[PDB]
RNA sequence: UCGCCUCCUAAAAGGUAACGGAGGCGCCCAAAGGUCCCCUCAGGCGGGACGGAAAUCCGCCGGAGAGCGCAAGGGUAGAAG
RNA sequence: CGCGGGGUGGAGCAGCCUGGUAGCUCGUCGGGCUCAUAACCCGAAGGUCGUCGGUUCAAAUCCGGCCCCCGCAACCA
RNA sequence: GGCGACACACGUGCUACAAUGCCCACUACAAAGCGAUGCCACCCGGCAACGGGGAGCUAAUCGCAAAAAGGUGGGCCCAGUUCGGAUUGGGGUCUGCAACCCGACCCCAUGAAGCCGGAAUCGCUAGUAAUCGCGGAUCAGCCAUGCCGCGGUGAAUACG
């Protein structure tokens, strides 16, 4: 009787990936995530 | 507040990029505080000066569009 | 509500490899994540009409489970409220619930946590099962940031089957957890 | 007024032009 | 007439009401009306049920506004909690971060007059 | 000091003295009571954002050292909690 | 017991019948006037107006009702 | 590196608190001064500081450079506001080897205190006071609200 509801969501990352899961609020605007690693920079 | 270049000294990379060609240590004294922060040099320790002594200021991946000075306070009691 | 990436990705990927990894035989001996208790507590409820039921409710949108009205045993003279009735907060996570929250906790709130550099290389040591220490909170793919009256840390305790470390390690190690190594 | 780097008089006070004082 | 955050201008020329919104300045706004061919004069109390949202559309959906900007700011503030940028301190330290004069002024960043004064002279 | 409750004294039944040795009471609680349904500690050692040396957590080992309004004492989780 | 009367900055006392201000000082802090000091001179920290219930647009104040003080006259199986 | 510090303090001033006002547009009227690796008309690119090209000017002869407060029209209707712009985020320009400590601008966004100022205190006897714009010296640039000059509009009152 007192919960966060839930529904199928389609999350849009910031580089490409689009994980299609559930939770709360159908549209999610993510910055980064997996498919974003190990993005190194070399080292002197 | 440049537009064409990055004022960062040369007596630094002629030291930072040689040390670059290998992956060595980090004790790197220097007075060139007046200089941008070299991309990649993130992971290296620069002994910035402040009229007093060199400074074990490391270097992160988030301090590039910032001259070495921004991390080497001058006056005491801040 | 009968399927995620993990829960699935755990079976078709985590089950076979693990098994073949250490050398178990039947499907149970193989270690498995069981549940995830996660509590905030706060302990920031004292004088001047200090409610904070939103504090909870707001955690409810991040988990899916409306937290527990915790209290504290003794009495802390050396600092505020005493003999039960104050505040401690907590929401235990069990399968599906746990899988979901767990899922995006291995996809979003990994870097969003300020800087980052990788999870501690040893926070379950000896006694199987892993606990994590939280500072932030809005790094969550929800809980807007222009609605945070305050920022409170929390505790995610992720308990398992793996009776050793090498095991509980592996489990997560091979699943989606990144370690500072 | 005389300061608001955003109006006629201001650019003036601050002896300069821009999009709030057309250099003609 | 909500639009961005729980904000609602009303009773006055549209091209000004807009400023009210967090993230909207004099420029932007009056651009909001030209872009969507909407008329400035016309109040807020006289805008077709269409023009209304029709506006909010372009609006809300381009330059992040009130809210998603609010502490979107602290992002690059707190972000300065790094190894410590001079500009870090100042916020970190509650003072002027634009190479200013503290010695005397700076009362917007310091709480107004925190007196606590002393100094003795010479008696007889 | 003067009525009252607890312990020792008090010599294994009871009681038993001193201007003996050492503490309390002159209240409380409409739930802190009837009852029926549920539940389990203290600590120790790991593991944990604020975190003492015990907050609230997680994992083991731990039957009672916790609690029970209050003095001590009897008693008690197979519940009085 | 009843008639009164009384509590409001750290102590002092006005605001008490009028509703509409939370003040007057002592004392700490600054800052004023001199040639400097003294002395006068200003502005501030600071009070649930004891308590709670209340009518009002609003309460220290008029209403309530009680804790609490002090005067008296009386009560004490 | 510091003279730029900063719990504070006083002195000199800048911007204001607004309708005798502010904003945008248009449209008039100066005087004084300074200009060669100087001042840059004028086209072009950016809502812009500015950049490219480029004519003139040894300057009464070419330019800074147009004056603002007026006037005229339109916008605001008494609100912490279209007042006031402090502080803060961002994106940028020129300079200069170099602008973190330490520049000035421009641009987007935040829009702070202030609704007229305690005791006290200062200036001024008329082209003055008040309020409005313009110059130059020092200068690579600039922290110029200063300093030295200029010109525009133009009061009040003095019994004693």
Swiss-Prot record, chain A:
Protein function: Binds the 23S rRNA.
Positions of transmembrane segments: none
Coiled-coil region: none
Requisite cofactors: Zn(2+)
Record carries keyword Zinc: yes
Keywords, comma-separated and alphabetical: Metal-binding, Ribonucleoprotein, Ribosomal protein, RNA-binding, rRNA-binding, Zinc
GO molecular function, one term: structural constituent of ribosome
Subunit note: Part of the 50S ribosomal subunit.
Alphabetical GO biological process terms: translation
Domain of life (superkingdom): Bacteria
Family the UniProt entry places it in: Belongs to the bacterial ribosomal protein bL31 family. Type A subfamily.
Protein name: Large ribosomal subunit protein bL31
Residues of the full protein shown: 4 to 47 of 71
Organism, as annotated: Thermus thermophilus (strain ATCC 27634 / DSM 579 / HB8)
Cofactor binding notes: Binds 1 zinc ion per subunit.
Record bears the keyword Cytoplasm: no
Chain sites annotated for binding Zn(2+): 13, 15, 33, 36
GO CC annotation: ribonucleoprotein complex; ribosome
UniProtKB/Swiss-Prot annotation, chain B:
Gene Ontology molecular function terms on file: rRNA binding; structural constituent of ribosome
Secretion signal, residue range per the UniProt entry: none
Entry GO terms, CC: cytoplasm; small ribosomal subunit
One BP term from GO: ribosomal small subunit assembly
Keywords: Ribonucleoprotein, Ribosomal protein, RNA-binding, rRNA-binding
Residues in coiled coil: none
The organism's place on the tree of life at top rank: Bacteria
Subunit and interaction comment: Part of the 30S ribosomal subunit. Forms a loose dimer with protein S13.
Role played: Located at the top of the head of the 30S subunit, extending towards the 50S subunit, which it may contact in the 70S complex. Contacts several RNA helices of the 16S rRNA.
Family to which the UniProt record says this protein belongs: Belongs to the universal ribosomal protein uS19 family.
Name of this chain's protein: Small ribosomal subunit protein uS19
Species, as recorded: Thermus thermophilus (strain ATCC 27634 / DSM 579 / HB8)
Gene it is expressed from: rpsS
Covered range of the whole protein: 4 to 81 of 93
UniProtKB/Swiss-Prot annotation, chain C:
Gene Ontology terms: cellular component: ribonucleoprotein complex; ribosome
GO MF, one annotated term: rRNA binding
GO biological process: translation
Keywords, alphabetical: Ribonucleoprotein, Ribosomal protein, RNA-binding, rRNA-binding, tRNA-binding
Family of the protein in this entry: Belongs to the universal ribosomal protein uL5 family.
Function: This is one of the proteins that bind and probably mediate the attachment of the 5S RNA into the large ribosomal subunit, where it forms part of the central protuberance. In the 70S ribosome it contacts protein S13 of the 30S subunit (forming bridge B1b) connecting the head of the 30S subunit to the top of the 50S subunit. The bridge itself contacts the P site tRNA and is implicated in movement during ribosome translocation.
NCBIfam families associated with the record: PRK00010.1 (NF000585)
Subunit composition and interactions: Part of the 50S ribosomal subunit; part of the 5S rRNA/uL5/uL18/bL25 (TL7) subcomplex; has also been isolated as a complex with 5S rRNA, bL25 (TL7) and DNA binding protein II. Forms a bridge to the 30S subunit in the 70S ribosome, contacting protein uS13; this bridge is straddled by the 5S rRNA. Contacts the P site tRNA.
Name of the protein: Large ribosomal subunit protein uL5
Source organism of this protein record: Thermus thermophilus (strain ATCC 27634 / DSM 579 / HB8)
Name of the gene this protein is made from: rplE
Swiss-Prot record, chain E:
GO CC annotation terms, alphabetical: cytosol; small ribosomal subunit
InterPro entries: Rbsml_uS13_C, Ribosomal_uS13, Ribosomal_uS13-like_H2TH, Ribosomal_uS13_bac-type, Ribosomal_uS13_CS
PROSITE patterns listed in its UniProt record: RIBOSOMAL_S13_1, RIBOSOMAL_S13_2
GO BP term, example: translation
Superkingdom, natural source: Bacteria
Annotated keywords: Ribonucleoprotein, Ribosomal protein, RNA-binding, rRNA-binding, tRNA-binding
Cited function: Located at the top of the head of the 30S subunit, it contacts several helices of the 16S rRNA. In the 70S ribosome structure it contacts the 23S rRNA (bridge B1a) and protein L5 of the 50S subunit (bridge B1b), connecting the top of the two subunits; these bridges are in contact with the A site and P site tRNAs respectively and are implicated in movement during ribosome translocation. Separately contacts the tRNAs in the A and P sites.
PANTHER family xrefs: 30S RIBOSOMAL PROTEIN S13/40S RIBOSOMAL PROTEIN S18, SMALL RIBOSOMAL SUBUNIT PROTEIN US13M
Subunit structure: Part of the 30S ribosomal subunit. Forms a loose heterodimer with protein S19. Forms two bridges to the 50S subunit in the 70S ribosome, contacting protein L5 and the 23S rRNA; these bridges are straddled by the 5S rRNA.
Similarity field: Belongs to the universal ribosomal protein uS13 family.
Protein name per UniProt: Small ribosomal subunit protein uS13
Encoding gene, per UniProt annotation: rpsM
């Amino acid at each position: 009787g007192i919960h966060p509801k839930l529904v199928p969501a389609r999350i849009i990352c910031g580089c490409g990936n689009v994980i299609e899961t559930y939770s709360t609020k159908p549209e999610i605007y993510v910055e980064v995530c997996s498919k974003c690693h190990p993005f190194y920079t070399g080292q002197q | 507040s440049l537009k064409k270049g990055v004022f960062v000294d040369d007596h630094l990379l002629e030291k930072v990029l040689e040390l670059n060609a290998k992956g060595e240590k980090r004790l790197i004294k220097t007075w060139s505080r007046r200089s941008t922060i070299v991309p990649e040099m993130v992971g290296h320790t620069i002994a910035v000066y402040n009229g007093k002594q060199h400074v074990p200021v490391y270097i992160t991946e988030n301090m590039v569009g910032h001259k070495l000075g921004e991390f080497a306070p001058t006056r005491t009691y801040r | 509500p009968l399927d995620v990436a993990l829960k699935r990705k755990y079976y078709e990927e985590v089950r076979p490899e693990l098994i073949r990894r250490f050398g178990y035989q039947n499907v149970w001996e193989v270690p498995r994540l069981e549940k995830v208790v996660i509590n905030q507590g706060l302990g920031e409820a004292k004088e001047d009409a200090r409610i904070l039921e939103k504090a909870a409710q707001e955690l409810a949108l991040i988990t899916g489970q409306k937290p527990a009205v915790t209290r504290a045993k003794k009495s802390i003279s050396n600092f505020k409220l005493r003999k039960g009735m104050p505040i401690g907060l907590r929401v235990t996570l069990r399968r599906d619930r746990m899988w979901i929250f767990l899922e995006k906790l291995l996809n979003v709130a990994l870097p969003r946590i300020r800087d980052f550099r990788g999870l501690n290389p040893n926070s379950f040591d000896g006694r199987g099962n892993y606990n994590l220490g939280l500072r932030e909170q809005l790094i969550f793919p929800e809980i807007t940031y222009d609605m945070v009256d305050a920022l409170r840390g929390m505790d995610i305790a992720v308990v398992t089957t793996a009776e050793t470390d090498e095991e509980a390690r592996a489990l997560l190690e091979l699943l989606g957890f990144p370690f500072r190594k | 007024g005389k300061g608001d780097r955003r109006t006629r008089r201001g650019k003036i006070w601050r002896g300069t032009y821009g999009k709030y004082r057309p250099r003609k | 007439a909500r639009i961005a955050g729980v904000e609602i201008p009303r009773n006055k020329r549209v091209d000004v009401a807009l400023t009210y919104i967090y993230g909207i300045g004099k420029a932007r706004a009056k651009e909001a009306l030209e872009k969507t061919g909407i008329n400035p004069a016309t109040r807020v109390k006289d805008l077709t049920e269409a023009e209304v949202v029709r506006l909010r559309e372009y609006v809300e959906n381009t330059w992040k506004l009130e809210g998603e900007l609010r502490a979107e700011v602290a992002a690059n503030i707190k972000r300065l909690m790094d190894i410590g940028c001079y500009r870090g301190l100042r916020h970190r330290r509650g003072l002027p971060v634009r190479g200013q004069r503290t010695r005397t002024n700076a009362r917007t960043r310091k709480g107004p007059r925190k007196t606590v004064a002393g100094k003795k002279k010479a008696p007889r």
